[PDB]
Subunit: 125 residues, 4 copies
Protein backbone atom coordinates (compact mmCIF):
# COMPACT_ATOMS: atom_id res chain seq x y z
CA UNK A 1 0.00 0.00 0.00
CA UNK A 2 2.83 2.37 -0.91
CA UNK A 3 1.91 3.22 -4.49
CA UNK A 4 3.14 2.15 -7.91
CA UNK A 5 6.34 4.22 -7.97
CA UNK A 6 7.62 2.55 -4.82
CA UNK A 7 7.05 -0.84 -6.45
CA UNK A 8 8.92 0.24 -9.60
CA UNK A 9 11.87 1.28 -7.44
CA UNK A 10 11.95 -2.30 -6.20
CA UNK A 11 11.87 -1.40 -2.52
CA UNK A 12 11.06 -4.25 -0.15
CA UNK A 13 10.26 -3.14 3.37
CA UNK A 14 11.42 -5.14 6.36
CA UNK A 15 9.96 -2.66 8.83
CA UNK A 16 7.59 0.32 8.93
CA UNK A 17 7.17 1.46 12.54
CA UNK A 18 6.18 4.85 14.00
CA UNK A 19 9.89 5.45 14.67
CA UNK A 20 11.84 3.57 11.97
CA UNK A 21 11.47 2.14 8.49
CA UNK A 22 13.92 -0.23 6.75
CA UNK A 23 13.87 -1.28 3.10
CA UNK A 24 16.18 -3.33 0.87
CA UNK A 25 16.74 -2.75 -2.84
CA UNK A 26 19.36 -3.01 -5.55
CA UNK A 27 20.80 -1.11 -8.48
CA UNK A 28 19.24 -2.39 -11.70
CA UNK A 29 20.15 -1.68 -15.29
CA UNK A 30 16.92 0.27 -15.84
CA UNK A 31 17.83 2.61 -12.94
CA UNK A 32 21.13 3.85 -14.40
CA UNK A 33 22.31 7.16 -15.78
CA UNK A 34 24.42 7.10 -18.99
CA UNK A 35 27.77 6.30 -17.31
CA UNK A 36 26.59 3.01 -15.84
CA UNK A 37 26.03 4.11 -12.23
CA UNK A 38 22.80 4.70 -10.35
CA UNK A 39 20.83 7.77 -11.45
CA UNK A 40 21.01 10.15 -8.50
CA UNK A 41 17.27 10.77 -8.62
CA UNK A 42 16.82 7.13 -7.63
CA UNK A 43 18.60 7.80 -4.32
CA UNK A 44 16.28 10.78 -3.71
CA UNK A 45 13.16 8.75 -4.52
CA UNK A 46 14.30 5.93 -2.23
CA UNK A 47 14.97 8.45 0.54
CA UNK A 48 11.54 9.98 -0.05
CA UNK A 49 9.86 6.56 -0.02
CA UNK A 50 11.34 5.20 3.20
CA UNK A 51 10.90 8.42 5.16
CA UNK A 52 7.31 9.11 4.02
CA UNK A 53 6.32 5.53 4.83
CA UNK A 54 7.61 5.98 8.38
CA UNK A 55 6.10 9.47 8.70
CA UNK A 56 2.71 8.24 7.48
CA UNK A 57 2.86 5.31 9.92
CA UNK A 58 3.73 7.65 12.79
CA UNK A 59 0.80 9.96 12.04
CA UNK A 60 -1.46 6.90 11.80
CA UNK A 61 -5.21 7.38 12.13
CA UNK A 62 -4.67 11.03 13.14
CA UNK A 63 -4.21 12.32 9.58
CA UNK A 64 -1.91 12.10 6.57
CA UNK A 65 1.45 13.46 5.38
CA UNK A 66 2.52 15.35 2.25
CA UNK A 67 6.12 15.73 1.09
CA UNK A 68 7.53 19.26 1.53
CA UNK A 69 11.24 18.91 0.63
CA UNK A 70 14.04 16.41 0.13
CA UNK A 71 17.81 16.95 0.39
CA UNK A 72 19.93 13.91 -0.53
CA UNK A 73 23.76 13.63 -0.67
CA UNK A 74 25.42 10.96 -2.84
CA UNK A 75 28.66 9.71 -1.30
CA UNK A 76 29.68 6.75 -3.48
CA UNK A 77 28.77 5.62 -7.00
CA UNK A 78 26.50 2.59 -7.06
CA UNK A 79 26.29 -0.13 -9.72
CA UNK A 80 24.72 -3.54 -10.13
CA UNK A 81 28.01 -4.95 -8.80
CA UNK A 82 27.47 -3.29 -5.44
CA UNK A 83 24.74 -5.73 -4.41
CA UNK A 84 21.97 -5.15 -1.90
CA UNK A 85 21.41 -1.66 -0.48
CA UNK A 86 19.67 -1.01 2.86
CA UNK A 87 17.80 2.26 3.48
CA UNK A 88 16.91 3.14 7.07
CA UNK A 89 14.73 6.12 8.01
CA UNK A 90 15.10 7.62 11.48
CA UNK A 91 13.11 10.52 12.92
CA UNK A 92 14.64 13.92 13.54
CA UNK A 93 11.50 15.79 14.61
CA UNK A 94 7.87 14.62 14.75
CA UNK A 95 5.58 17.47 15.74
CA UNK A 96 2.10 18.87 15.23
CA UNK A 97 2.47 20.30 11.71
CA UNK A 98 5.93 19.12 10.55
CA UNK A 99 8.03 15.97 10.46
CA UNK A 100 11.71 15.67 9.49
CA UNK A 101 13.25 12.22 8.89
CA UNK A 102 16.83 11.18 8.06
CA UNK A 103 17.47 8.24 5.71
CA UNK A 104 20.80 6.43 5.25
CA UNK A 105 21.43 4.10 2.30
CA UNK A 106 24.33 1.67 2.97
CA UNK A 107 25.81 -1.35 1.21
CA UNK A 108 26.35 -4.76 2.84
CA UNK A 109 29.74 -3.65 4.22
CA UNK A 110 28.11 -0.66 5.95
CA UNK A 111 29.59 1.79 3.43
CA UNK A 112 27.44 4.95 3.29
CA UNK A 113 26.23 5.31 -0.31
CA UNK A 114 23.69 8.11 0.17
CA UNK A 115 21.94 10.04 2.92
CA UNK A 116 18.90 12.32 2.76
CA UNK A 117 16.57 14.39 4.91
CA UNK A 118 12.85 14.64 4.11
CA UNK A 119 10.52 17.31 5.50
CA UNK A 120 6.82 16.43 5.61
CA UNK A 121 3.66 18.38 6.47
CA UNK A 122 0.99 16.77 8.69
CA UNK A 123 -2.59 17.00 7.36
CA UNK A 124 -4.47 16.27 10.56
CA UNK A 125 -8.11 15.17 10.85
CA UNK B 1 21.75 9.33 -24.75
CA UNK B 2 20.53 10.11 -21.24
CA UNK B 3 20.10 6.61 -19.85
CA UNK B 4 17.16 4.32 -19.20
CA UNK B 5 15.87 6.01 -16.04
CA UNK B 6 15.43 9.32 -17.85
CA UNK B 7 13.36 7.52 -20.49
CA UNK B 8 11.19 5.86 -17.82
CA UNK B 9 10.51 9.28 -16.30
CA UNK B 10 9.10 10.27 -19.68
CA UNK B 11 11.23 13.38 -20.04
CA UNK B 12 11.36 14.88 -23.52
CA UNK B 13 14.05 17.49 -23.98
CA UNK B 14 13.45 20.58 -26.07
CA UNK B 15 16.89 21.99 -25.33
CA UNK B 16 20.24 20.92 -23.87
CA UNK B 17 22.71 23.80 -24.15
CA UNK B 18 25.85 24.63 -22.13
CA UNK B 19 23.74 27.16 -20.22
CA UNK B 20 20.15 25.84 -20.16
CA UNK B 21 18.16 22.64 -20.50
CA UNK B 22 14.37 22.37 -20.93
CA UNK B 23 12.27 19.22 -20.76
CA UNK B 24 8.54 18.46 -20.83
CA UNK B 25 6.83 15.63 -18.99
CA UNK B 26 3.59 14.69 -17.26
CA UNK B 27 2.27 13.01 -14.15
CA UNK B 28 1.34 9.42 -14.95
CA UNK B 29 -0.51 6.86 -12.88
CA UNK B 30 2.64 4.76 -12.46
CA UNK B 31 4.46 7.78 -10.94
CA UNK B 32 2.07 8.31 -8.02
CA UNK B 33 2.34 7.86 -4.29
CA UNK B 34 -0.63 6.23 -2.46
CA UNK B 35 -2.78 9.40 -2.19
CA UNK B 36 -3.00 9.93 -5.94
CA UNK B 37 -0.45 12.73 -6.33
CA UNK B 38 3.05 12.65 -7.78
CA UNK B 39 5.63 10.78 -5.70
CA UNK B 40 8.02 13.46 -4.48
CA UNK B 41 11.03 11.41 -5.53
CA UNK B 42 9.88 11.90 -9.12
CA UNK B 43 10.37 15.67 -8.77
CA UNK B 44 13.89 15.06 -7.42
CA UNK B 45 14.76 12.67 -10.26
CA UNK B 46 13.43 15.13 -12.85
CA UNK B 47 15.47 17.91 -11.24
CA UNK B 48 18.53 15.66 -11.25
CA UNK B 49 17.97 14.70 -14.90
CA UNK B 50 17.57 18.17 -16.37
CA UNK B 51 20.44 19.70 -14.41
CA UNK B 52 22.93 16.87 -15.04
CA UNK B 53 22.12 16.93 -18.76
CA UNK B 54 22.96 20.63 -18.87
CA UNK B 55 26.04 20.22 -16.66
CA UNK B 56 27.34 17.37 -18.81
CA UNK B 57 26.75 19.43 -21.96
CA UNK B 58 28.59 22.40 -20.45
CA UNK B 59 31.62 20.30 -19.53
CA UNK B 60 31.57 18.81 -23.04
CA UNK B 61 34.70 17.13 -24.36
CA UNK B 62 36.67 18.39 -21.33
CA UNK B 63 35.46 15.64 -18.96
CA UNK B 64 32.36 14.28 -17.25
CA UNK B 65 30.10 15.07 -14.29
CA UNK B 66 28.95 13.04 -11.28
CA UNK B 67 26.01 13.96 -9.05
CA UNK B 68 27.03 15.18 -5.58
CA UNK B 69 23.74 16.35 -3.99
CA UNK B 70 20.15 17.32 -4.75
CA UNK B 71 17.79 19.54 -2.74
CA UNK B 72 14.24 19.78 -4.13
CA UNK B 73 11.23 21.66 -2.66
CA UNK B 74 7.67 20.61 -3.57
CA UNK B 75 5.31 23.58 -3.69
CA UNK B 76 2.06 22.17 -5.11
CA UNK B 77 0.61 18.67 -5.41
CA UNK B 78 0.65 17.32 -8.96
CA UNK B 79 -1.78 14.88 -10.57
CA UNK B 80 -2.60 13.60 -14.02
CA UNK B 81 -5.17 16.41 -14.19
CA UNK B 82 -2.45 19.04 -14.02
CA UNK B 83 -1.28 18.40 -17.58
CA UNK B 84 2.14 19.10 -19.05
CA UNK B 85 5.00 20.12 -16.74
CA UNK B 86 8.06 22.07 -17.94
CA UNK B 87 11.42 21.71 -16.16
CA UNK B 88 14.09 24.32 -16.87
CA UNK B 89 17.66 24.07 -15.56
CA UNK B 90 19.68 27.25 -15.16
CA UNK B 91 23.28 27.53 -13.98
CA UNK B 92 24.22 28.96 -10.61
CA UNK B 93 27.97 28.28 -10.70
CA UNK B 94 30.07 26.45 -13.31
CA UNK B 95 33.67 26.18 -12.19
CA UNK B 96 36.74 23.96 -12.35
CA UNK B 97 35.69 21.21 -9.92
CA UNK B 98 32.03 22.00 -9.08
CA UNK B 99 28.80 22.93 -10.82
CA UNK B 100 25.53 24.04 -9.19
CA UNK B 101 22.33 24.23 -11.27
CA UNK B 102 18.80 25.37 -10.36
CA UNK B 103 15.77 23.61 -11.88
CA UNK B 104 12.18 24.92 -11.85
CA UNK B 105 9.22 22.67 -12.67
CA UNK B 106 6.11 24.69 -13.67
CA UNK B 107 2.68 23.87 -15.08
CA UNK B 108 1.20 25.44 -18.23
CA UNK B 109 -0.10 28.44 -16.23
CA UNK B 110 3.40 29.14 -14.91
CA UNK B 111 2.52 27.85 -11.44
CA UNK B 112 5.69 26.70 -9.64
CA UNK B 113 5.20 23.02 -8.78
CA UNK B 114 8.75 22.18 -7.64
CA UNK B 115 12.23 23.65 -7.58
CA UNK B 116 15.58 21.98 -6.91
CA UNK B 117 19.31 22.65 -6.80
CA UNK B 118 21.82 20.03 -7.96
CA UNK B 119 25.54 20.06 -7.12
CA UNK B 120 27.83 18.19 -9.50
CA UNK B 121 31.53 17.32 -9.48
CA UNK B 122 33.61 17.75 -12.66
CA UNK B 123 35.77 14.75 -13.62
CA UNK B 124 38.16 16.46 -16.02
CA UNK B 125 40.37 14.76 -18.61
CA UNK C 1 13.84 47.63 13.15
CA UNK C 2 15.65 44.43 12.21
CA UNK C 3 17.17 43.47 15.55
CA UNK C 4 20.62 43.70 17.09
CA UNK C 5 22.20 40.77 15.24
CA UNK C 6 21.46 42.34 11.87
CA UNK C 7 23.19 45.52 13.05
CA UNK C 8 26.24 43.55 14.23
CA UNK C 9 26.48 41.94 10.79
CA UNK C 10 26.79 45.45 9.40
CA UNK C 11 24.00 45.06 6.87
CA UNK C 12 22.72 48.29 5.33
CA UNK C 13 19.48 47.91 3.42
CA UNK C 14 18.87 49.80 0.22
CA UNK C 15 15.47 48.20 -0.31
CA UNK C 16 12.89 46.12 1.57
CA UNK C 17 9.84 45.60 -0.66
CA UNK C 18 7.17 42.86 -0.66
CA UNK C 19 9.05 41.27 -3.55
CA UNK C 20 12.76 42.12 -3.12
CA UNK C 21 15.27 43.17 -0.49
CA UNK C 22 18.81 44.46 -1.15
CA UNK C 23 21.54 45.03 1.42
CA UNK C 24 25.22 46.00 1.27
CA UNK C 25 27.91 44.83 3.68
CA UNK C 26 31.59 43.96 3.87
CA UNK C 27 33.95 41.37 5.29
CA UNK C 28 35.44 42.67 8.53
CA UNK C 29 38.25 41.28 10.63
CA UNK C 30 35.84 40.35 13.43
CA UNK C 31 33.81 38.22 10.98
CA UNK C 32 36.64 35.87 9.99
CA UNK C 33 37.37 32.22 10.61
CA UNK C 34 40.97 31.25 11.54
CA UNK C 35 42.36 31.20 7.96
CA UNK C 36 41.57 34.84 7.28
CA UNK C 37 38.44 34.41 5.15
CA UNK C 38 34.80 35.05 6.01
CA UNK C 39 33.28 32.61 8.51
CA UNK C 40 30.70 30.66 6.51
CA UNK C 41 28.07 31.18 9.18
CA UNK C 42 28.20 34.89 8.32
CA UNK C 43 26.97 34.11 4.79
CA UNK C 44 24.10 32.07 6.25
CA UNK C 45 23.14 34.83 8.69
CA UNK C 46 23.23 37.44 5.91
CA UNK C 47 21.07 35.18 3.74
CA UNK C 48 18.67 34.70 6.65
CA UNK C 49 18.55 38.45 7.35
CA UNK C 50 17.81 39.67 3.84
CA UNK C 51 15.22 37.00 3.09
CA UNK C 52 13.34 37.30 6.40
CA UNK C 53 13.21 41.08 6.05
CA UNK C 54 11.57 40.69 2.64
CA UNK C 55 9.27 37.88 3.84
CA UNK C 56 8.17 39.93 6.85
CA UNK C 57 7.52 42.95 4.62
CA UNK C 58 5.48 40.82 2.21
CA UNK C 59 3.30 39.42 5.00
CA UNK C 60 2.85 42.97 6.33
CA UNK C 61 -0.05 43.70 8.66
CA UNK C 62 -1.47 40.20 8.00
CA UNK C 63 0.84 38.41 10.45
CA UNK C 64 4.48 37.56 11.09
CA UNK C 65 7.15 35.12 9.87
CA UNK C 66 9.40 32.63 11.66
CA UNK C 67 12.50 31.04 10.14
CA UNK C 68 12.09 27.34 9.31
CA UNK C 69 15.31 26.43 7.44
CA UNK C 70 18.31 27.89 5.62
CA UNK C 71 20.52 26.27 2.97
CA UNK C 72 23.49 28.40 1.85
CA UNK C 73 26.27 27.48 -0.64
CA UNK C 74 29.65 29.24 -0.49
CA UNK C 75 31.20 29.63 -3.94
CA UNK C 76 34.24 31.86 -3.38
CA UNK C 77 36.33 32.78 -0.33
CA UNK C 78 35.75 36.33 0.87
CA UNK C 79 38.21 38.64 2.62
CA UNK C 80 38.45 42.28 3.56
CA UNK C 81 40.22 42.79 0.22
CA UNK C 82 37.09 41.79 -1.68
CA UNK C 83 35.29 45.04 -0.90
CA UNK C 84 31.55 45.64 -0.81
CA UNK C 85 29.17 42.68 -1.05
CA UNK C 86 25.55 42.99 -2.25
CA UNK C 87 22.88 40.54 -1.06
CA UNK C 88 19.60 40.41 -2.98
CA UNK C 89 16.59 38.36 -1.85
CA UNK C 90 14.07 37.25 -4.45
CA UNK C 91 10.88 35.28 -3.83
CA UNK C 92 10.48 31.68 -4.89
CA UNK C 93 7.06 30.99 -3.35
CA UNK C 94 4.86 33.21 -1.16
CA UNK C 95 1.78 31.33 0.00
CA UNK C 96 -0.65 30.99 2.88
CA UNK C 97 1.52 29.10 5.38
CA UNK C 98 5.01 29.04 3.76
CA UNK C 99 7.44 31.37 2.04
CA UNK C 100 10.67 30.43 0.24
CA UNK C 101 13.16 33.15 -0.76
CA UNK C 102 16.46 32.95 -2.68
CA UNK C 103 19.35 35.25 -1.74
CA UNK C 104 22.46 35.91 -3.86
CA UNK C 105 25.58 37.56 -2.40
CA UNK C 106 27.83 39.06 -5.13
CA UNK C 107 30.92 41.26 -5.20
CA UNK C 108 31.22 44.51 -7.16
CA UNK C 109 32.26 42.61 -10.32
CA UNK C 110 29.10 40.48 -10.13
CA UNK C 111 31.05 37.42 -8.98
CA UNK C 112 28.73 35.06 -7.06
CA UNK C 113 30.21 34.65 -3.57
CA UNK C 114 27.32 32.82 -1.88
CA UNK C 115 23.71 31.86 -2.48
CA UNK C 116 21.08 30.60 -0.05
CA UNK C 117 17.42 29.61 0.19
CA UNK C 118 15.36 30.40 3.29
CA UNK C 119 12.04 28.75 4.17
CA UNK C 120 9.73 30.71 6.46
CA UNK C 121 6.43 29.93 8.18
CA UNK C 122 3.61 32.53 8.16
CA UNK C 123 2.02 33.23 11.55
CA UNK C 124 -1.19 34.88 10.38
CA UNK C 125 -3.52 37.05 12.48
CA UNK D 1 42.36 29.25 17.81
CA UNK D 2 38.93 29.30 16.15
CA UNK D 3 38.77 32.91 15.00
CA UNK D 4 37.03 36.04 16.23
CA UNK D 5 33.53 35.21 14.98
CA UNK D 6 33.44 32.00 17.00
CA UNK D 7 34.35 34.01 20.11
CA UNK D 8 31.60 36.56 19.40
CA UNK D 9 29.08 33.71 19.16
CA UNK D 10 30.10 32.79 22.69
CA UNK D 11 30.84 29.17 21.91
CA UNK D 12 32.81 27.29 24.55
CA UNK D 13 34.15 23.95 23.40
CA UNK D 14 34.21 20.96 25.70
CA UNK D 15 35.62 18.68 23.03
CA UNK D 16 37.23 18.85 19.58
CA UNK D 17 38.23 15.34 18.48
CA UNK D 18 38.74 13.86 14.99
CA UNK D 19 35.27 12.34 15.32
CA UNK D 20 33.20 14.68 17.52
CA UNK D 21 33.05 18.27 18.72
CA UNK D 22 30.85 19.61 21.54
CA UNK D 23 30.26 23.25 22.44
CA UNK D 24 28.01 25.08 24.91
CA UNK D 25 26.47 28.50 24.36
CA UNK D 26 23.41 30.57 25.15
CA UNK D 27 20.93 32.94 23.56
CA UNK D 28 21.92 36.52 24.34
CA UNK D 29 20.05 39.74 23.75
CA UNK D 30 22.54 40.83 21.08
CA UNK D 31 21.85 37.61 19.11
CA UNK D 32 18.11 38.18 18.64
CA UNK D 33 15.92 38.98 15.67
CA UNK D 34 13.18 41.64 16.13
CA UNK D 35 10.59 39.32 17.75
CA UNK D 36 12.78 38.43 20.71
CA UNK D 37 13.93 34.97 19.62
CA UNK D 38 17.30 33.81 18.33
CA UNK D 39 18.22 35.05 14.86
CA UNK D 40 18.21 31.94 12.68
CA UNK D 41 21.57 32.85 11.18
CA UNK D 42 23.05 32.29 14.64
CA UNK D 43 22.01 28.62 14.51
CA UNK D 44 23.67 28.30 11.09
CA UNK D 45 26.89 29.95 12.30
CA UNK D 46 26.98 27.72 15.38
CA UNK D 47 26.44 24.66 13.17
CA UNK D 48 29.21 25.87 10.86
CA UNK D 49 31.56 26.51 13.78
CA UNK D 50 31.23 23.17 15.55
CA UNK D 51 31.39 21.09 12.37
CA UNK D 52 34.36 22.93 10.83
CA UNK D 53 36.29 22.68 14.10
CA UNK D 54 35.81 18.91 14.07
CA UNK D 55 36.54 18.63 10.33
CA UNK D 56 39.73 20.67 10.69
CA UNK D 57 40.81 18.53 13.64
CA UNK D 58 40.15 15.34 11.66
CA UNK D 59 42.22 16.53 8.70
CA UNK D 60 44.99 17.53 11.13
CA UNK D 61 48.51 18.01 9.79
CA UNK D 62 47.43 16.59 6.40
CA UNK D 63 45.85 19.84 5.15
CA UNK D 64 43.02 22.26 5.81
CA UNK D 65 39.26 22.56 5.26
CA UNK D 66 37.08 25.19 3.58
CA UNK D 67 33.31 25.48 4.03
CA UNK D 68 31.30 24.44 0.95
CA UNK D 69 27.66 24.52 2.13
CA UNK D 70 25.45 24.59 5.21
CA UNK D 71 21.82 23.45 5.59
CA UNK D 72 20.28 24.12 9.02
CA UNK D 73 16.68 23.43 10.19
CA UNK D 74 15.20 25.40 13.11
CA UNK D 75 12.78 23.29 15.14
CA UNK D 76 11.96 25.43 18.19
CA UNK D 77 12.24 29.15 18.96
CA UNK D 78 15.05 29.97 21.37
CA UNK D 79 15.22 32.82 23.88
CA UNK D 80 17.37 33.86 26.80
CA UNK D 81 14.89 31.96 28.99
CA UNK D 82 15.83 28.68 27.36
CA UNK D 83 19.20 28.49 29.10
CA UNK D 84 22.29 26.62 27.97
CA UNK D 85 22.37 25.07 24.49
CA UNK D 86 24.66 22.16 23.55
CA UNK D 87 25.85 21.70 19.95
CA UNK D 88 27.34 18.34 18.99
CA UNK D 89 28.96 17.66 15.61
CA UNK D 90 29.10 14.08 14.34
CA UNK D 91 30.67 12.88 11.10
CA UNK D 92 28.61 11.65 8.18
CA UNK D 93 31.42 11.14 5.65
CA UNK D 94 35.14 11.92 5.93
CA UNK D 95 36.91 11.23 2.66
CA UNK D 96 39.77 12.39 0.45
CA UNK D 97 38.27 15.59 -0.96
CA UNK D 98 34.98 16.05 0.98
CA UNK D 99 33.67 15.94 4.53
CA UNK D 100 30.04 16.08 5.67
CA UNK D 101 29.20 16.62 9.36
CA UNK D 102 25.86 16.71 11.19
CA UNK D 103 25.35 19.10 14.12
CA UNK D 104 22.50 18.96 16.67
CA UNK D 105 21.72 21.88 18.98
CA UNK D 106 19.68 20.79 22.05
CA UNK D 107 18.54 22.43 25.28
CA UNK D 108 19.18 21.01 28.76
CA UNK D 109 16.06 18.82 28.54
CA UNK D 110 17.33 17.25 25.30
CA UNK D 111 14.80 19.16 23.20
CA UNK D 112 16.09 19.50 19.62
CA UNK D 113 16.29 23.23 18.87
CA UNK D 114 18.18 23.10 15.56
CA UNK D 115 20.06 20.66 13.35
CA UNK D 116 22.38 21.30 10.42
CA UNK D 117 24.64 19.56 7.92
CA UNK D 118 27.91 21.14 6.77
CA UNK D 119 29.85 20.09 3.66
CA UNK D 120 33.57 20.88 3.64
CA UNK D 121 36.32 20.58 1.04
CA UNK D 122 39.74 19.17 2.03
CA UNK D 123 42.75 21.23 0.92
CA UNK D 124 45.46 18.61 1.28
CA UNK D 125 49.21 19.23 1.49
C1 LIG E 1 23.87 12.59 -18.47
C2 LIG E 1 24.29 12.51 -17.03
C3 LIG E 1 25.61 12.65 -16.58
C4 LIG E 1 25.92 12.56 -15.21
C5 LIG E 1 24.94 12.32 -14.24
C6 LIG E 1 23.61 12.15 -14.62
C7 LIG E 1 22.52 11.89 -13.67
C8 LIG E 1 22.78 11.81 -12.20
O1 LIG E 1 23.30 12.83 -11.68
O2 LIG E 1 22.47 10.80 -11.54
C9 LIG E 1 21.22 11.75 -14.15
C10 LIG E 1 20.93 11.85 -15.52
C11 LIG E 1 21.92 12.09 -16.46
C12 LIG E 1 23.24 12.24 -16.05
C1 LIG F 1 2.89 6.56 1.82
C2 LIG F 1 3.16 8.00 1.49
C3 LIG F 1 2.47 9.08 2.05
C4 LIG F 1 2.78 10.40 1.71
C5 LIG F 1 3.79 10.70 0.79
C6 LIG F 1 4.51 9.68 0.18
C7 LIG F 1 5.59 9.91 -0.81
C8 LIG F 1 5.99 11.29 -1.19
O1 LIG F 1 6.38 12.04 -0.26
O2 LIG F 1 5.98 11.66 -2.38
C9 LIG F 1 6.26 8.81 -1.34
C10 LIG F 1 5.93 7.50 -0.97
C11 LIG F 1 4.92 7.23 -0.06
C12 LIG F 1 4.22 8.27 0.52
C1 LIG G 1 38.59 26.28 12.19
C2 LIG G 1 37.93 26.41 10.84
C3 LIG G 1 38.48 25.93 9.65
C4 LIG G 1 37.81 26.08 8.43
C5 LIG G 1 36.57 26.73 8.34
C6 LIG G 1 35.97 27.24 9.49
C7 LIG G 1 34.67 27.94 9.49
C8 LIG G 1 33.88 28.10 8.23
O1 LIG G 1 33.57 27.05 7.63
O2 LIG G 1 33.54 29.23 7.84
C9 LIG G 1 34.15 28.40 10.70
C10 LIG G 1 34.84 28.23 11.91
C11 LIG G 1 36.08 27.59 11.96
C12 LIG G 1 36.64 27.10 10.80
C1 LIG H 1 12.59 40.78 10.68
C2 LIG H 1 12.56 39.29 10.90
C3 LIG H 1 11.39 38.55 11.09
C4 LIG H 1 11.44 37.16 11.29
C5 LIG H 1 12.64 36.46 11.33
C6 LIG H 1 13.85 37.14 11.16
C7 LIG H 1 15.17 36.48 11.19
C8 LIG H 1 15.28 35.00 11.37
O1 LIG H 1 14.70 34.29 10.52
O2 LIG H 1 15.96 34.52 12.29
C9 LIG H 1 16.32 37.25 11.00
C10 LIG H 1 16.24 38.63 10.79
C11 LIG H 1 15.02 39.31 10.77
C12 LIG H 1 13.85 38.60 10.94
Amino acid sequence: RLGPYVEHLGLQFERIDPDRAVAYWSVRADLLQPHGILHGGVHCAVVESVASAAADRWLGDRGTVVGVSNSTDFFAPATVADGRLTSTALPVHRGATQQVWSVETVDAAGRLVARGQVRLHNLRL
